[PDB]
Design an enzyme around this catalytic site. Sequence first.
Site, PDB file in Angstrom:
ATOM      1  N   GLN A  78       3.338   1.513   3.113  1.00 53.16           N
ATOM      2  CA  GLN A  78       3.081   0.464   4.094  1.00 53.16           C
ATOM      3  C   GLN A  78       3.539  -0.891   3.573  1.00 53.16           C
ATOM      4  OE1 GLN A  78      -0.794   0.436   5.816  1.00 53.16           O
ATOM      5  NE2 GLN A  78      -0.546  -1.630   6.668  1.00 53.16           N
ATOM      6  N   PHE A  90       4.661   1.326   8.644  1.00 56.91           N
ATOM      7  CA  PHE A  90       4.639   2.279   7.549  1.00 56.91           C
ATOM      8  C   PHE A  90       5.719   3.328   7.738  1.00 56.91           C
ATOM      9  CE2 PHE A  90       2.362   5.584   9.926  1.00 56.91           C
ATOM     10  CZ  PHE A  90       1.693   4.836  10.881  1.00 56.91           C
ATOM     11  N   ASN A 111      -1.495  -1.352  12.856  1.00 55.65           N
ATOM     12  CA  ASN A 111      -2.235  -2.202  13.788  1.00 55.65           C
ATOM     13  C   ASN A 111      -3.705  -2.219  13.396  1.00 55.65           C
ATOM     14  OD1 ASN A 111      -3.714  -0.002  15.194  1.00 55.65           O
ATOM     15  ND2 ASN A 111      -1.697   0.535  16.043  1.00 55.65           N
ATOM     16  N   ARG A 163       0.848  -1.186   0.000  1.00 56.60           N
ATOM     17  CA  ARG A 163       0.000   0.000   0.000  1.00 56.60           C
ATOM     18  C   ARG A 163       0.886   1.238   0.000  1.00 56.60           C
ATOM     19  NH1 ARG A 163      -4.151   3.015   3.928  1.00 56.60           N
ATOM     20  NH2 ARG A 163      -5.976   3.003   2.530  1.00 56.60           N
ATOM     21  N   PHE A 204       1.357  10.604   1.926  1.00 58.28           N
ATOM     22  CA  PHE A 204       0.868  10.043   3.179  1.00 58.28           C
ATOM     23  C   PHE A 204       1.876   9.020   3.716  1.00 58.28           C
ATOM     24  CE2 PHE A 204      -2.804   7.416   5.218  1.00 58.28           C
ATOM     25  CZ  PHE A 204      -2.338   7.751   6.483  1.00 58.28           C
ATOM     26  N   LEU A 233      -2.150  10.322  14.026  1.00 56.64           N
ATOM     27  CA  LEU A 233      -1.841   8.966  14.441  1.00 56.64           C
ATOM     28  C   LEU A 233      -1.160   8.908  15.798  1.00 56.64           C
ATOM     29  CD1 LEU A 233      -0.579   7.737  10.989  1.00 56.64           C
ATOM     30  CD2 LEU A 233      -2.887   7.522  11.980  1.00 56.64           C
ATOM     31  N   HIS A 282      -0.461   4.673  17.258  1.00 58.73           N
ATOM     32  CA  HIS A 282       0.492   3.821  16.551  1.00 58.73           C
ATOM     33  C   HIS A 282       1.885   4.067  17.109  1.00 58.73           C
ATOM     34  CE1 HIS A 282      -2.234   2.448  13.280  1.00 58.73           C
ATOM     35  NE2 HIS A 282      -2.858   3.572  13.573  1.00 58.73           N
TER      36      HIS A 282
END
Length: 164
Positions: free
Chosen positions: A62, A112, A101, A54, A59, A121, A125
């Site tokens: 991942q 990521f 997660n 991904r 952004f 986040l 995370h």
Amino acid sequence: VNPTVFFDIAVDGEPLGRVSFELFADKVPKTAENFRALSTGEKGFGYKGSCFHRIIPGFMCQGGDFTRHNGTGGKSIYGEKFEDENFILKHTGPGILSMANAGPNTNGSQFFICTAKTEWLDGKHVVFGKVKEGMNIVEAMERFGSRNGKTSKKITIADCGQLE
């Protein structure tokens, strides 16, 4: 004292370049050690040969699902999932290394690399490392992502291990 780990990235099997990561073992030792061991493969499984499934430009990138290659799999050295260790470190900008997660205390092997400040986040995370060398390679990986995260070419960890 903090370990440095490298990934040699390939794009459809063609070498792109090397990214190295400092892992904050001083502040999140357990979560840093999971990523370190998976990078060297010293427990018999790990990231070598796995893909970045991904990639969202602007952004994050991942990866780390080395068992189903699509975001549904992976596992930690400690078992199928382990706890959130702490949230000392924050998502302060591009190059941050953070755990993916599926809710509280569900860390496995997915992670990521941030390509943007991701402050929403924070506290959700576990941040555990940063890009040291090769941010330009992460930037190059971004160009193979898309708005929904699907990549236009296969982006793989061709080799990985520990440098320091």
